[PDB]
Design a protein around this nucleic acid. Sequence first.
RNA 1: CGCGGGGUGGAGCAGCCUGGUAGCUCGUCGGGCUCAUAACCCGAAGGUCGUCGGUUCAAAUCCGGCCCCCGCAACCA
RNA 2: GGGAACCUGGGGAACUGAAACAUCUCAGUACCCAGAGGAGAGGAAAGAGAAAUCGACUCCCUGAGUAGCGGCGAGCGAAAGG
RNA 3: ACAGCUCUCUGCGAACUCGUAAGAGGAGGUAUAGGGAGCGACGCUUGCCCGGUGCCGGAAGGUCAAGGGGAGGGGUGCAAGC
RNA 4: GAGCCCGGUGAAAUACCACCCUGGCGCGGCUGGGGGCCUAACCCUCGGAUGGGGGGACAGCGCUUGGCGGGCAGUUUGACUG
RNA 5: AGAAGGGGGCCUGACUGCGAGGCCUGCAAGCCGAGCAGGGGCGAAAGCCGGGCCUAGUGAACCGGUGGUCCCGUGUGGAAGG
Lengths: 88, 145, 190
Amino acid sequence: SGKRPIVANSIQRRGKAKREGGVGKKTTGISKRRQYPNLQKVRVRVAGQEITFRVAASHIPKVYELVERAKGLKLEGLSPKEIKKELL
Amino acid sequence: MKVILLEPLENLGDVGQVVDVKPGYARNYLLPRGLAVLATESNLKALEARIRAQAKRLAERKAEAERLKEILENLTLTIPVRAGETKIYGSVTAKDIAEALSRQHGVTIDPKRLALEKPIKELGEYVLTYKPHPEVPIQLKVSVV
Amino acid sequence: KVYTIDEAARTAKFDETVEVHAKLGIDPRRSDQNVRGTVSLPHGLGKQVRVLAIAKGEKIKEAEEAGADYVGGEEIIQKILDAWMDFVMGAVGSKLGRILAPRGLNPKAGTVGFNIGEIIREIKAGRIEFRNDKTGAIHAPVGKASFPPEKLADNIRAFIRALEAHKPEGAKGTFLRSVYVTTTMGPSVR
RNA sequence: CGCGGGGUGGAGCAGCCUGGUAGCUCGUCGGGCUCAUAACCCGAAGGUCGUCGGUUCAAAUCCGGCCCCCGCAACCA
RNA sequence: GGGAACCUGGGGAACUGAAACAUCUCAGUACCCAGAGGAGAGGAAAGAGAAAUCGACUCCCUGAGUAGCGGCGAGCGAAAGG
RNA sequence: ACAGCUCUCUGCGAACUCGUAAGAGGAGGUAUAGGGAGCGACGCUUGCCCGGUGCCGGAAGGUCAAGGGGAGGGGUGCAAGC
RNA sequence: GAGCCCGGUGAAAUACCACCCUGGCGCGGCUGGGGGCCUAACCCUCGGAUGGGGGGACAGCGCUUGGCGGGCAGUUUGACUG
RNA sequence: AGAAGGGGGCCUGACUGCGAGGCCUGCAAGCCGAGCAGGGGCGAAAGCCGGGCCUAGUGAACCGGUGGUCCCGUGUGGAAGG
Ligand SMILES: [Mg+2]
Ligand SMILES: [Mg+2]
Ligand SMILES: [Mg+2]
Ligand SMILES: [Mg+2]
Ligand SMILES: [Mg+2]
Ligand SMILES: [Mg+2]
Ligand SMILES: [Mg+2]
Ligand SMILES: [Mg+2]
Ligand SMILES: [Mg+2]
Ligand SMILES: [Mg+2]
Ligand SMILES: [Mg+2]
Ligand SMILES: [Mg+2]
Ligand SMILES: [Mg+2]
Ligand SMILES: [Mg+2]
Ligand SMILES: [Mg+2]
Ligand SMILES: [Mg+2]
Ligand SMILES: [Mg+2]
Ligand SMILES: [Mg+2]
Ligand SMILES: [Mg+2]
Ligand SMILES: [Mg+2]
Ligand SMILES: [Mg+2]
Ligand SMILES: [Mg+2]
Ligand SMILES: [Mg+2]
Ligand SMILES: [Mg+2]
Ligand SMILES: [Mg+2]
Ligand SMILES: [Mg+2]
Ligand SMILES: [Mg+2]
Ligand SMILES: [Mg+2]
Ligand SMILES: [Mg+2]
Ligand SMILES: [Mg+2]
Ligand SMILES: [Mg+2]
Ligand SMILES: [Mg+2]
Ligand SMILES: [Mg+2]
Ligand SMILES: [Mg+2]
Ligand SMILES: [Mg+2]
Ligand SMILES: [Mg+2]
Ligand SMILES: [Mg+2]
Ligand SMILES: [Mg+2]
Ligand SMILES: [Mg+2]
Ligand SMILES: [Mg+2]
Ligand SMILES: [Mg+2]
Ligand SMILES: [Mg+2]
Ligand SMILES: [Mg+2]
Ligand SMILES: [Mg+2]
Ligand SMILES: [Mg+2]
Ligand SMILES: [Mg+2]
Ligand SMILES: [Mg+2]
Ligand SMILES: [Mg+2]
Ligand SMILES: [Mg+2]
Ligand SMILES: [Mg+2]
Ligand SMILES: [Mg+2]
Ligand SMILES: [Mg+2]
Ligand SMILES: [Mg+2]
Ligand SMILES: [Mg+2]
Ligand SMILES: [Mg+2]
Ligand SMILES: [Mg+2]
Ligand SMILES: [Mg+2]
Ligand SMILES: [Mg+2]
Ligand SMILES: [Mg+2]
Ligand SMILES: [Mg+2]
Ligand SMILES: [Mg+2]
Ligand SMILES: [Mg+2]
Ligand SMILES: [Mg+2]
């Protein structure tokens, strides 16, 4: 849906087994469909002056590192892509 | 979550310390209200030396007391204290004590951190000390004419 | 500790109270606790354990000297087995279920030292110098021991009650012990 | 096949896992309640404690092995 | 922004077939969107695979309709090595 | 269809609807209101059956998915182990 | 096992140290469930707020578990037979 | 019935290995079966016994389940699994 230091996402399927065991008797899957594992989002404000983030979720800290800067920055309103484009 | 603190806090307040916590507490209260900081080896190493660059920075106000102890100890003072027997005349302020040490042997005097409570104002023998912490007690003598 | 510290048994009186307390599994299916009957036990003991051989009234010159000290005969069949304070203790082997004056009137019975070669020779050993310990329920363990004086040479409580672990079936894993008593009890591994 | 729960006077329930001495309830029948009745009151006999046998001095019972009983069970070429 | 096809990524059918059909098939095809260009992608080993071996990648011919995969049905189908 | 009757849902970021979502209707409304359902001015009325079904209510029990749990067992290494 | 007792008798004898079944309390661990208050995340708001109100670890959203689910979908619904 | 029937005595051939040679037959199935070898039952013996007087009393493969044996066991060993 977005990403920030992360990435968009996948749309893997949902197999469906009314199976048995192979570790018992036979087994089988009735069907499956196109899923949507929505790359776990979440947002984080934070401050360089007062910025906004839709941080990944995994990489949540990551932000807080980028936080720990100080490279003489002023009135940008944005001021983030200014941390990011210098981000790992 | 390793983090250095500040304003000593209960349960974990030994300032400039190291304590683990749930990311939340840090990431939301502690961290925001400038009461601590990330385990960041950076702020960690830098802090570390913000100690050793102070431990021996103040440990000089103690190191140059041992050079002044092994001297101001023995070597007394012998003041020409213009007096004569009974109740002396011009009490001994360190404005004179240090004045008869600094302005006598070319040695550092601290006309305050000397242990002087009152001017004496009488001839005899004393042994007050050099303040604070470890102390060098200069044995001071009084004279006449 | 380290091995099996023997002289760990050190005041009281004449220290002769070492033990071999150790648990394991209850009755894993069939078997349970059956140590070796009168095991050899690598100890000269010195135990002048007054053992009796109810053999016959004809073996009273060497049945006494049969490794113990006092041994009677068959006159203990109906002369010594009728009371509550009157009735070791041996019996008769082969197949004779001779359990009349010694089964109700109980103290020690199973079989006597199969030595028809002699009741007391110089080639037969272990009849009055061995020990044992069947079961004990929800409180097993406990074995025999000698005195206090015995350097790293009293390794008999670490071979007769610790190797007698051949009467254990399957269902768990033996554990936790200690060799001492009338003093305390320190534990030793294996 | 996995698990694990109950046989106790006629009936349907406790009790034992802490052994140690079998008791509720309803009824069977006989008195007491009126002319009689249900409401009622009392006195009663009625179990080898399922068994093949393991323990303990001794089991209803302590733990297994066995015939149904009884619920959870997961498929089923 | 455009471009006859040709390439890569992101999405992504069903009819059909199985003589019904739901796994399976058609098929990662069709089509949709982005993007690259005379081509595109891939490319110097965290490989391969049993050889004391080989030595980036891509294309062709064999390996081979083999090994395997499979309501073991219909059917799909490699790789090393040469 | 209709006014009108009744049951029912909904406390406001309402319920309900459209939409992946953002957003929007609802409604710049707030139970004397909004949605859903059946009946269909108005007159007299509208009986009995909660066994089955649906729904409302039940901080006890029965059953039950992960996950937690690890008595016990198997695989390997000379072993610490995995 | 005899100084820190037998006895007499019964299924078993005590003064003492033990290893442990039965079971509860006594300070710690590792984990759990609950009921409280909080604010600072998330939400909603306020003459435009670096802030103030109210909600508050809940809700919302990611993943995973099980179930309800003709709202929608793909389908099956044998053959002989005057 | 000159037994397949009624009764008594010992036994478990209601065996393992196979099968010349036929019946029936579209295929696949089904059917009777001499005799050899192995070790056995009954009998004094010649001999009979590979289930039941006889035709019905049943279900291809696929998929799993339990047993065991020699075979396989993805560098080799052993396992997981065939
Ligand atoms: Mg199914
Ligand atoms: Mg399948
Ligand atoms: Mg399909
Ligand atoms: Mg994480
Ligand atoms: Mg940066
Ligand atoms: Mg990186
Ligand atoms: Mg135990
Ligand atoms: Mg008597
Ligand atoms: Mg029962
Ligand atoms: Mg019952
Ligand atoms: Mg019954
Ligand atoms: Mg009964
Ligand atoms: Mg118990
Ligand atoms: Mg009663
Ligand atoms: Mg009654
Ligand atoms: Mg009656
Ligand atoms: Mg009555
Ligand atoms: Mg009658
Ligand atoms: Mg009457
Ligand atoms: Mg009776
Ligand atoms: Mg009986
Ligand atoms: Mg009887
Ligand atoms: Mg009973
Ligand atoms: Mg009984
Ligand atoms: Mg039990
Ligand atoms: Mg079943
Ligand atoms: Mg273009
Ligand atoms: Mg299809
Ligand atoms: Mg098909
Ligand atoms: Mg189909
Ligand atoms: Mg289909
Ligand atoms: Mg070209
Ligand atoms: Mg190129
Ligand atoms: Mg390189
Ligand atoms: Mg070519
Ligand atoms: Mg090629
Ligand atoms: Mg070929
Ligand atoms: Mg090739
Ligand atoms: Mg309503
Ligand atoms: Mg509006
Ligand atoms: Mg109508
Ligand atoms: Mg009326
Ligand atoms: Mg009803
Ligand atoms: Mg009801
Ligand atoms: Mg409810
Ligand atoms: Mg579980
Ligand atoms: Mg191990
Ligand atoms: Mg005494
Ligand atoms: Mg305990
Ligand atoms: Mg605790
Ligand atoms: Mg608040
Ligand atoms: Mg607030
Ligand atoms: Mg939540
Ligand atoms: Mg339909
Ligand atoms: Mg059908
Ligand atoms: Mg017709
Ligand atoms: Mg017979
Ligand atoms: Mg044939
Ligand atoms: Mg034959
Ligand atoms: Mg037969
Ligand atoms: Mg099939
Ligand atoms: Mg199958
Ligand atoms: Mg291998």
